[PDB]
Design an enzyme around this catalytic site. Sequence first.
Site, mmCIF file in Angstrom:
data_model
loop_
_atom_site.group_PDB
_atom_site.id
_atom_site.type_symbol
_atom_site.label_atom_id
_atom_site.label_comp_id
_atom_site.label_asym_id
_atom_site.label_seq_id
_atom_site.Cartn_x
_atom_site.Cartn_y
_atom_site.Cartn_z
ATOM 1 N N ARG A 1 0.814 -1.221 0.000
ATOM 2 C CA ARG A 1 0.000 0.000 0.000
ATOM 3 C C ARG A 1 0.847 1.271 0.000
ATOM 4 O O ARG A 1 0.489 2.270 -0.596
ATOM 5 C CB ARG A 1 -1.011 -0.009 1.133
ATOM 6 N N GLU B 1 -9.813 6.158 7.177
ATOM 7 C CA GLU B 1 -8.370 6.340 7.124
ATOM 8 C C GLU B 1 -7.880 7.544 6.353
ATOM 9 O O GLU B 1 -6.938 8.194 6.795
ATOM 10 C CB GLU B 1 -7.739 5.139 6.513
HETATM 11 N N1 LIG Z 1 -13.115 6.299 16.871
HETATM 12 C C1 LIG Z 1 -12.328 5.504 16.120
HETATM 13 N N2 LIG Z 1 -12.195 5.739 14.739
HETATM 14 C C2 LIG Z 1 -11.522 5.016 13.831
HETATM 15 C C3 LIG Z 1 -10.743 3.791 14.450
HETATM 16 C C4 LIG Z 1 -10.920 3.594 15.908
HETATM 17 O O1 LIG Z 1 -10.275 2.597 16.472
HETATM 18 N N3 LIG Z 1 -11.712 4.477 16.622
HETATM 19 N N4 LIG Z 1 -9.952 2.962 13.525
HETATM 20 C C5 LIG Z 1 -9.545 3.528 12.148
HETATM 21 C C6 LIG Z 1 -9.218 2.542 11.192
HETATM 22 S S1 LIG Z 1 -7.737 1.847 11.231
HETATM 23 C C7 LIG Z 1 -10.194 2.137 10.205
HETATM 24 S S2 LIG Z 1 -9.410 0.952 9.238
HETATM 25 C C8 LIG Z 1 -11.640 2.735 10.180
HETATM 26 C C9 LIG Z 1 -12.679 1.776 10.085
HETATM 27 O O2 LIG Z 1 -13.799 2.422 9.392
HETATM 28 P P1 LIG Z 1 -14.804 1.685 8.779
HETATM 29 O O3 LIG Z 1 -15.323 0.664 9.488
HETATM 30 O O4 LIG Z 1 -16.022 2.526 8.656
HETATM 31 O O5 LIG Z 1 -14.209 1.052 7.518
HETATM 32 O O6 LIG Z 1 -11.699 3.288 11.510
HETATM 33 C C10 LIG Z 1 -10.788 4.388 11.586
HETATM 34 N N5 LIG Z 1 -11.421 5.268 12.501
HETATM 35 O O1 MOS Z 2 -5.812 0.983 9.704
HETATM 36 MO MO1 MOS Z 2 -7.338 0.252 9.525
HETATM 37 O O2 MOS Z 2 -6.515 -0.756 7.988
HETATM 38 S S1 MOS Z 2 -7.141 -1.305 10.765
#
Ligand SMILES: Nc1nc2c(c(=O)[nH]1)N[C@H]1C(S)=C(S)[C@@H](COP(=O)(O)O)O[C@H]1N2
Ligand code: MOS
EC number: 1.1.1.204
Lengths: 49, 760, 49, 48, 48, 450, 450
Positions: free
Chosen positions: B309, B713
């Site tokens: 990535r 992300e």
């Molecule tokens: N509040 C909060 N937001 C977050 C996280 C979290 O642990 N807590 N993890 C991040 C990561 S690594 C990802 S991969 C996405 C997941 O979003 P999604 O489920 O809607 O794909 O959460 C992002 N935002």
């Molecule tokens: O950083 Mo989200 O790919 S777990």
Amino acid sequence: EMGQGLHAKMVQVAAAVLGIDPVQVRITATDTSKVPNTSATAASSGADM
Amino acid sequence: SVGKPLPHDSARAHVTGQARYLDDLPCPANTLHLAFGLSTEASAAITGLDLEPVRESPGVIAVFTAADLPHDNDASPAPSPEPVLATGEVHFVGQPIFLVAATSHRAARIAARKARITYAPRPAILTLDQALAADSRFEGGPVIWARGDVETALAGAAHLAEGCFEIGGQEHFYLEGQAALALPAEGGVVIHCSSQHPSEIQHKVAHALGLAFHDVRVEMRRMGGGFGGKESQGNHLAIACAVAARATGRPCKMRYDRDDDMVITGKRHDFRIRYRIGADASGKLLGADFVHLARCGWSADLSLPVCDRAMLHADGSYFVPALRIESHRLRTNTQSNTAFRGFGGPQGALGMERAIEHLARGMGRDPAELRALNFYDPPEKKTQTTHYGQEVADCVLGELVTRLQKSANFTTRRAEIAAWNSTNRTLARGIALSPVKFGISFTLTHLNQAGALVQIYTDGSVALNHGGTEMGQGLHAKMVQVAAAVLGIDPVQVRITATDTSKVPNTSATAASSGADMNGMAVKDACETLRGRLAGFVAAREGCAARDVIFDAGQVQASGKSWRFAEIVAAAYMARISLSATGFYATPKLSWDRLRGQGRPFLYFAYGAAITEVVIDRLTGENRILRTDILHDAGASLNPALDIGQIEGAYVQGAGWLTTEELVWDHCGRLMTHAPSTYKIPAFSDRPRIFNVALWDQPNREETIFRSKAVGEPPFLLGISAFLALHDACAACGPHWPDLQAPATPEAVLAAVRRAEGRA
Amino acid sequence: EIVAAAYMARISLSATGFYATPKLSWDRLRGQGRPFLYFAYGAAITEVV
Amino acid sequence: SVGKPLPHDSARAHVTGQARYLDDLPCPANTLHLAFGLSTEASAAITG
Amino acid sequence: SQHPSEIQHKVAHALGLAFHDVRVEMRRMGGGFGGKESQGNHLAIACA
Amino acid sequence: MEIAFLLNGETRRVRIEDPTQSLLELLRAEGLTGTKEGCNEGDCGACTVMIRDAAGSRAVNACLMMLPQIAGKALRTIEGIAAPDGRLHPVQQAMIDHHGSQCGFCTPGFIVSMAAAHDRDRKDYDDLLAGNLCRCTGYAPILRAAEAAAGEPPADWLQADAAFTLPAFLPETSDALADWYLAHPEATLIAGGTDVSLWVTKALRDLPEVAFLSHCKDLAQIRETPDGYGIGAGVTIAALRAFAEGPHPALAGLLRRFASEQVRQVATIGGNIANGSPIGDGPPALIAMGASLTLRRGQERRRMPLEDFFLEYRKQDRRPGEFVESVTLPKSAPGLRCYKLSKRFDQDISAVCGCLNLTLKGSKIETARIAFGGMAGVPKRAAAFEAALIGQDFREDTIAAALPLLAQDFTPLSDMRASAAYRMNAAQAMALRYVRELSGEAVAVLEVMP
Amino acid sequence: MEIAFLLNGETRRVRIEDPTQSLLELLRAEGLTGTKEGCNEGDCGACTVMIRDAAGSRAVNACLMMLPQIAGKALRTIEGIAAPDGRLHPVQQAMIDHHGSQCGFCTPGFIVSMAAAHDRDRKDYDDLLAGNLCRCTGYAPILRAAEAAAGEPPADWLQADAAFTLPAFLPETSDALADWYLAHPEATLIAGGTDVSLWVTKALRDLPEVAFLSHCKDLAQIRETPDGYGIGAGVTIAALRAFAEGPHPALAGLLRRFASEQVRQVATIGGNIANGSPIGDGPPALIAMGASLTLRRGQERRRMPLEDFFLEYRKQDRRPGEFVESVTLPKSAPGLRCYKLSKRFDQDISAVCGCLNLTLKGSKIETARIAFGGMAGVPKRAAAFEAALIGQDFREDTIAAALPLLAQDFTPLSDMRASAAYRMNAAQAMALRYVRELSGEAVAVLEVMP
Ligand SMILES: Nc1nc2c(c(=O)[nH]1)N[C@H]1C(S)=C(S)[C@@H](COP(=O)(O)O)O[C@H]1N2
Ligand code: MOS
Ligand SMILES: Cc1cc2nc3c(=O)[nH]c(=O)nc-3n(C[C@H](O)[C@H](O)[C@H](O)COP(=O)(O)OP(=O)(O)OC[C@H]3O[C@@H](n4cnc5c(N)ncnc54)[C@H](O)[C@@H]3O)c2cc1C
Ligand SMILES: Cc1cc2nc3c(=O)[nH]c(=O)nc-3n(C[C@H](O)[C@H](O)[C@H](O)COP(=O)(O)OP(=O)(O)OC[C@H]3O[C@@H](n4cnc5c(N)ncnc54)[C@H](O)[C@@H]3O)c2cc1C
Ligand SMILES: Nc1nc2c(c(=O)[nH]1)N[C@H]1C(S)=C(S)[C@@H](COP(=O)(O)O)O[C@H]1N2
Ligand code: MOS
Ligand code: FES
Ligand code: FES
Ligand code: FES
Ligand code: FES
Ligand SMILES: [Ca+2]
């Protein structure tokens, strides 16, 4: 399941319909969050239905 | 219900302290508590292992060793194995060696410290340089992707910049730490755990116990933060509770203490990035050659997809005619690195932002115009592609940055700053704009699937369940809204249930910002089935067509009559219509080849941009963020309030990454920063004082759930602007290239200031 | 192996099932209709003292 | 598989006393226990 | 009980909750014979 | 031994068998699962709880707090922030309305902090919340919530606890203490407990023979004296900070970045001194300002200048049975200026702490008191540097020419917070900073507004 | 008070604080959830467990057994029926192969009884499993299972328990007992515990001042005497049955239908007599055979004929401090014949118990001993009937003519077991039975083969 063997019978129906050995099929607890709006198990209709 | 700014499904339970996390679950009184004994050597064979003092420790019930593992000893998320207990040797300070189960969490930690181990040390590989010299790596050799001919392009270039620079890793610092609980359940087990990837826990626990997957169930209701740190590191704790519970016959719990959490688990990969980049006389880029060195730790873990990535984002936001990337994934005797918000993205992108900044300083041009000139072309013969050959048909960076620059008052503010610096000799202000283009979808294509299971009870209430795990991003409120919109009822009638492998099977980790994208589709797929059934039923009953049955606002309408959703549901029940349905979704259009570096690994790209203003103290390096302005593209957001919330939090976490967060190991490989008192994440007052965040509201071109875009992300990369801004300030102190490194701690800023100043 | 490949090919491996007994209908108050699908039969001969 | 004379899904568990019924489930230490107070009259108004 | 959906229904009503906030699991009974088609309702209501 | 205290409104009596157990564990074992464990080390705020006694109410970290410390007090945890009838506290509702939480885990501690601040109407948020970490939200929505809640009448149900109470040793007077300690020289004295509880939670140590000083009202007084102010050993850093705001703003500004509010409310100056850490922030400051220290053994009473108390790293001028009873500050010291330098501004440990006090005879340097923490095994004046400074003119270039003498005064170490070259260079920079500051120039990054 | 016993192969030492707790509760409280509670009254067998000691091994109902009783014994529950390496006992595999279970809930108790029978190679299944009810299977398949496992070498792991041990008062000798009882007249004496445990489990009573007689070897002896056999009070109904098989088959046949094997294994004749229930089955029999009873108080020792011990319903000729020590039976009584009438044959309470003993002088009736239980508030001879019988000829018709006198000897009750009319009519029917049987006619439904 109350002793009448319902679970074993459903295990057999599934293993027969998927083509596989019964031992690959595992029964899980009856749970209104998995199959909803069920009727009582009764009227001897447990296995038919 | 889509589009409305509704609160998190659990806001009320958070705020009164009623929401349970894993260690709050009530457990039976005979529950055991566990802890790992750890390696104190970065690399050594284990020569002796006296656990007697452990067994004799108060409250101890059982102690375990690799020999005691009844079947698999493997927690890796990849083909190559990664033991859970050390098998005869150790590969980093902190690798778990043995496992204690005691009647209390304290008794376990205490006993864990009393073993007598003798080792036979071996030379350890702890730096990139060492690993390169020893040819210590993964994938038997580097991975190179090339588009066009860089050497040719660079040789003939009006302008050129060469540069090298480190980028440090980052610790997740989820507030709730790793944790799991296993309960023997006649024949099989139930695992409760705090994990973004319960199907994998299922998989791993199964293999460790010798059971078919259908004898292991994993529930997970919510995590106190994940950020990627729980995509896989959940495996060890879960395997240990299950094995302990098969052995003693009793429920077993393990949660890490912060210190252990930080010593045992992985972190964002730190990188070294070498670049050469060149351009036209007008400013158009001609080429860019990058070499990436990534420190992966002692075991592969998720390094492969992470490094890929990074490679995929080496173009940043810019069209580059010729571009090459050589990516080394180096194995070292330290923590096995892993997923972290952005998953390689930010390193790769930061690589290109540094470069292009360097180039700009080189030609005395303003970085912003250089950037604006090289963004991919807007949409609407031959569309531009990325260096992996995927057409970029949705880039709105041009329009977007222009709009940000003006709302943010950029130009004027850049002038005020110059003037202000010219009157100050101790402080200096900096300001910078950085863009983002981040692809969405896991790059191991088959992971792009999701399921759901919906149930309607006869009083009209609804229970929704899907494969994604909630860790604070609002996934569960979004899915509730989707469901309420598609079934035509008010959200309050829809209740979310815990993620559970026995309800939706074979799920993928929640990650790659694909949680809502895919589960939303699955949820919609299940609700439409139900709604289809209900219309079919109202139609036949009132003799009309199904497309004319209308669900809206809790009411159902057909042939001029109307009823409440609950009456329709009761009538369908009496007419014997099934009220339960599953849902599934597989993202389309993806296809690509890793080894060749060609195809369409992403469905679409998320964009945004941030302008950050900072100040630094030329005497010590001390510094802070004064103002940040962001415009980010979340498509037609499913919930703008939760989206603004992700953007702010990710901004703060990215800037955290490139400013105060620093990991440090000593000569022997021990982690020296392993607690919040020495590893410093942003604190309340490090928040920007003026913090403007706005959303760019334009539907996605791709057919995503309600035309939204993932916003989890992408926005973390907006923090790069903070680092770029610290660099702007350093550059304002002298004529020399500051060569500012990441993390830009105060020591680092000071060093950059001095290079600039020519003071060495 | 078929299942692993179906997984890689992204094919959902989960399903609900439902059944409603057909041909039934009757009126309690009038005491007329078809309330049963079929009848079960048997017989026993017992000897006692 | 239908048609074969196979044992009850829980035969072994029954026979070793591993099968759990409701009162065997593990539960938290703070669990209460309940019991009803019953009428001693076949038909009556309750007065006190 | 032989009839978890009714237990669900009756507990929900006893508690003022929509059905989706009450889940009933039942893995096996040591005997029913019809006696647990409904007289399970009292105990469950009371525990809830 | 039995203690009593009010718990979320209800009286509670408890038999203490382990005086060292922390409040955070007692609570979690009682099932009050809402107080969370995020670090168990004082740094994260996730275990924040609210206590209240006659001095009023404050938020503190339950993980640093042992049980005997709450005797006679009223304790409120997150489960008791809402009203008995279920009404949410204004701060609760505001957190819902403004999306002040995402994962939820830091939520209770933020709510308790915020509640305690509302209770006394305090509005300095950045400082009140420094010690509640949140990894998810970026803090902004929590500021919005605090700001909306401020315009709401205080919760009546929280104030009502004011009406309350109206083995391991617990002295009530300096005399009782003095006596007993003299008999048990080897005892472990516990004041705020912020340094000691880490011996138990992290080093996993076990301390027998223990005394709690927090209940000697007489050990915790600020007294105006003929020639200065006498500050009791049991005065907390928060209380010292409040007092200094008037006569010693520079010490006040320094204490602003001492730990967090939560820790400041229970850590004591006496304790910061007795702990004897070369990175303590108190000692340098007090030395530059020329304070003195009073030891005490039974009825005996010594009295040196503070700097003389520290001998070598990990070793102090302290006699068996002797304890720290107070310190004395001049009524004034307008030349004092305190600098703290770390990786992060808030709640961080200093890589280098420099306290400077120069007195002038118009353009000429009369006296010079210059102290540093973190530059040595012990807090110490920079003799060579001070000396070469007297008589010289107070201009930047004269200070510039004396800087190398600091490399003679200190040979700083490298560690994870900073490299020796950096600490040296920063000690020097503090000097340049001082002239520039007094000379009216802009120098502090924290005072620049956007 | 501490006791010790072997539990499923493991040594166990326990602090008894409540001597009245049943073995069933201790077990389920220790997590040995495999023993079930199906009635908590001795009827269902679902709690059956296996004990062992010098006399050997037997199956008993854990719900009737209080802890003190198992001191020094080896105890085996369903969880320990399998071998340590997990191999199933021949009885477990057989139950699986023959479908001996359906709902499963009575399966443990059946397995334990079955395992005990297997250990001593007993095959009288109908009698051995009478006390295990199963509502689901019809019993047939459980018989197939017992048969199938009988041809299998006994489990070795089960016999190794043999090698073992080689508040409340627990006398070892009759003397120690007598002494102590004399001092605590008001104490509650517990032998088998089969009538007393129902006072605690159902009547919810609480008994302080308690003594267990099951550890007095000398109270549980069968001694051959010059003029009969001396049967100690602590002799169990099972043991009394075994002895009687020879000299008193009739009494033996009766005791066959006394409760179940599980209760027989611990219930005592002394207890059956001291309980004084008009529906006891022991008394009527013994009286028909003209045995005698021996009481005891310290060193004193009365001795009346059994029937004289019973005064009125719920009242006996027993003195403060006095206890039953034995009963004495004649060496022979070929005239004895015992009849029990209940709704069900096995494990039921008698509607009426008829014991008849007639001695003859060729065709003429010399002596007539006729006893009934359940015809009155007390077990008693039918005087007027007995009387009118003497001297008359022993033919059906003479008896037929005397029946009415029975309506003068007794005036039976009506209740859930039977109506007065039926009871009456049945007492009379027992009389016709006796002549018909002695005259060699077929009379018993249980002796009819298919
Ligand atoms: N509040 C909060 N937001 C977050 C996280 C979290 O642990 N807590 N993890 C991040 C990561 S690594 C990802 S991969 C996405 C997941 O979003 P999604 O489920 O809607 O794909 O959460 C992002 N935002
Ligand atoms: O950083 Mo989200 O790919 S777990
Ligand atoms: C999160 C965190 C942040 C911190 N930040 C800082 C910081 O920024 N700057 C800083 O300087 N320190 C910091 N500290 C520690 C600082 O010293 C202590 O936090 C505090 O000052 C010690 O106070 P105390 O009363 O709690 O001492 P205690 O823990 O109660 O005891 C400290 C030592 O002093 C002994 N003692 C206590 N009272 C006396 C007495 N009067 N006489 C003799 N001996 C006595 C005790 O026996 C023990 O040996 C921090 C701690 C934490 C948890
Ligand atoms: C399921 C079941 C079936 C039964 N079936 C029958 C049956 O068919 N026929 C029948 O007759 N009974 C039956 N009974 C009851 C029968 O009396 C008891 O089972 C038994 O005979 C009493 O013996 P025990 O030692 O257990 O008496 P215990 O329960 O030990 O009690 C004896 C009573 O007399 C006292 N006592 C005990 N020993 C002495 C002593 N030596 N001196 C003075 N007092 C003493 C005790 O304090 C108590 O008052 C049944 C009970 C149950 C549980
Ligand atoms: N072993 C056992 N069998 C049993 C029962 C039981 O409680 N235990 N209940 C009966 C009753 S009342 C019915 S209605 C049927 C239900 O069986 P089915 O599920 O196959 O209809 O099982 C019968 N067989
Ligand atoms: O009696 Mo069966 O209808 S439950
Ligand atoms: S748990 Fe982190 S501050 Fe107490
Ligand atoms: S809400 Fe997740 S830590 Fe603050
Ligand atoms: S529970 Fe029925 S005999 Fe013990
Ligand atoms: S199998 Fe149900 S009672 Fe025997
Ligand atoms: Ca981590």
